[model samples]
Target: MGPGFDFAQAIMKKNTVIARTEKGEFTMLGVYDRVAVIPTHASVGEIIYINDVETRVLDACALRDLTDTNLEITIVKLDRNQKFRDIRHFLPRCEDDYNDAVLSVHTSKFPNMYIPVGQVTNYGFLNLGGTPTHRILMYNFPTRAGQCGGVVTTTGKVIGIHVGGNGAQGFAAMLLHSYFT
Candidate 1:
């Protein structure tokens, strides 16, 4: 594997997490040290697990709603008591440009894997239910069916959370600096 492959492997080991709901399962990318963002549609108050350690969802916020766009996002906070390694330092600065190639950290049939680098098609609002909402569009990164709430990032910063997609194109909730502050 090349350097990108090695870096992806390391990210998968440290940043990938599982979100399980009564209906099904999804993946979350760890950001803000301990916070994991998931799709609001998948935010059914699922339990998040990191390497078999049970972590409770302290809160879920509809950072973006259907009123804003068809794609909705939920920012989840894990219990404060749970001990886990922080990956905040890996996140790129908020001002960094996100208009280049990106990576989607999602699940296949088994373990979590990084999808091939996807081009950042554009950044704007999309009509999901006739409501124009903010979102980020990425192309050439195919995702598995039912793959909701995964993390999409560039080299060092998370750009958004994977909500849904069709064919080779998909949508994510752009990570805004205000979300953390």
Candidate 2:
């Protein structure tokens, strides 16, 4: 089997779960990175349901552009008592070459998984008013209507968070190495 096959198998074993908010329920990729990226429209102070448990939103940031799509990423700290999987060790350096090929996983349906593999279509800047913002594009990615917030991974590491997409392509908040540090 190739790396794609191995990667898919490993992802199936990961602790990906469903995240529910007032807007709707979506996938919560994982918690190892210490940062939770969810859809942007979810209101702060509202409850987020995950793993049969509820947690309040602590912080959220929006990634928007005049031409590029928008995504709302949230930061939720997990309580020590909360049971969740940590995949921090699996996170890879945010490099152009590393993002060439990627995989997106959605677990909103539980054991019924949706893993779509594709390549980075492009990496460019989005003009948000006068400021430029970095964003990544994935071409020919099969994404469900509510698959926003899903985790995008490559080389056994996560590279971005699925934000939104049209039928032919999808956009994700490219997780920069500096952003994490």
Candidate 3:
């Protein structure tokens, strides 16, 4: 936890945590979130959130220039009409670790709707010109837009937010969902 951070609330809320042992080792395990399995190579600091779900806090971070890794982002489609949106102002940062998970989501103007997948994780960001921007590491579960603000797990550990995904391979900004945080 960081300065003035609430470790108790985090545990009670089932937020993802990074625990250390006196043995000088650390481990990550899922608490209340779900899990997912996608192609490897997904980098860290990518943005992601549940689709068509209620607004929540989301945020993202830029990867170090020295790390030439990229994450992948996918937006889920409720139909041809709606896409994704961003709501990062509400959610608070989980931790202040150097390699913390950044928040970013895909949303649309749907009522109580969400991504139709069982689990969505390790999503990246797309730019205005329709291109992959950032990358997120793998995490967990079969969730939908309604599952926003829930939790994402990796190896049973909370890793990301269940943002959105797309049918195509390339990236497009403001196309499938809104970008926030």
Clash pairs (backbone) in predicted model 1: 68-133, 69-133, 92-156, 92-157
Expressed as tens digits, the lDDT of each residue in 52-171 for candidate 1 is 567677777776544644447677788746444565555544433344444545554446555655566655666643546675555566665655666666655556767666566776
Q: What is the lDDT of residue 27 in candidate 3?
A: 16
Error of 1 at 13 (Å): 1.3
* Predictions: Cα RMSD each: 3.6, 4.5, 16.5
Question: Candidate 3: which stretches are off by over 4 Å?
Answer: 1-13, 16-132, 137-143, 167-181
RMSD of candidate 1 to true structure, Å: 3.6
Per-candidate TM vs. native? Answer: 0.74, 0.70, 0.24
Q: Could you give candidate 3's per-residue lDDT for residues 1-181 as a string of tens digits?
A: 3311232223213322221222211112122113221111222223222222232223223222234533333221111222212222222243211122222221232221222122333334434125344543223333233223223322212334432334222121111111221
Q: List, in order, the clash count of every candidate structure.
A: 4, 2, 42
Better of 2 and 3 by lDDT: 2
Error in Å for residue 38 of model 2: 1.8
**lDDT measured at residue 105 in model 3 versus the true structure, 0 to 100:** 23
